[PDB]
Design a protein around this ligand. Structure first.
Ligand SMILES: CCCCCCCCCCCC(=O)O
Ligand SMILES: CCCCCCCCCCCC(=O)O
Lengths: 156, 156
């Protein structure tokens, strides 16, 4: 990923988001309801220090579970770290704060990206920006959700 | 689907094909390795009468199985019928016979389409034609395969 948001203000991505679309480099990352990167964003909570708390849902061991993860800031405003055994990066590609946000997670390559939107509607303009960003990346699975699904736990 | 191949010669689609890409209206049709429309074309066998025999593979009850289905001709050269409990149509959107073929199956709507190619290579021109045909259709999952996967049973 060589598309980052110039001039990102992380405080202004705060609040409610919907995972309208998702893509990944490997089918197995998004294939099943319980695939490892099939995660649905609920809320972004930037910290005063400029870290990013992410509230999401995931189908795990038979049901829809809530998880909270923190992505720590780096020297680059558009790039956060979630490290454990593995060094992983969260990248903000593009946002207008009020309607859409494009982001990817990548390892150290495998990756997964999402088109986030503020409301349970299909934003054709946001999806066209997402597809343009992906034309640069080696994606092998793409999913998108309808407005009914966007209002359900785990997009059921 | 309102894109059919004008002037189709069904005899000239005979022989070896590879399921390079697949798309469908509903995630659940293609999501799992064993999802109902996750089928890999091996061979097209037009009959002297102008019916279409389709040899394909599918992951069913734990393994990669061979199936043969016949799609019966209609009054329209680009449209075949596979009926059982349900009336389903196979539509040929576009082909150049020697490199790529675009086809969909639809019910009576849910649908699934494939980009078929003659060789285990990523044909960017065929994929751009597939994406152009899909921009007309309500697809929510898209998969594509690499050349290593294209040479394995059930694209493992
Ligand atoms: C800016 C944060 C956007 C959240 C989605 C990141 C990209 C998809 C991968 C999600 C997986 C995870 O965060 O564990
Ligand atoms: C011209 C035949 C092409 C074969 C693929 C048809 C479209 C995808 C759906 C396959 C499912 C099936 O044929 O049972």
């Amino acid at each position: 990923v060589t598309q980052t948001m110039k001039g990102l203000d992380i405080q202004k991505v705060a609040g409610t988001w919907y995972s309208l679309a998702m893509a990944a480099s490997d089918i197995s990352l998004l294939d099943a309801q319980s695939a490892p990167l099939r995660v649905y964003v609920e809320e972004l909570k930037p910290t005063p220090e400029g870290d990013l708390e992410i509230l999401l849902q995931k189908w795990e061991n038979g049901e829809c579970a809530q998880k909270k993860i923190i992505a720590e800031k780096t020297k680059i405003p558009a790039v956060f770290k979630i490290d454990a055994l593995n060094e992983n990066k969260v990248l903000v590609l593009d946002t207008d704060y009020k309607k859409y946000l494009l982001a990817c997670m990548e390892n150290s390559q495998s990756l997964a990206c999402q088109c986030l939107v503020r409301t349970p509607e299909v934003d054709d303009e946001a999806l066209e920006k997402f597809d343009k960003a992906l034309k640069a990346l080696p994606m092998h699975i793409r999913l998108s959700f309808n407005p009914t699904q966007l209002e359900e736990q785990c997009h059921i």
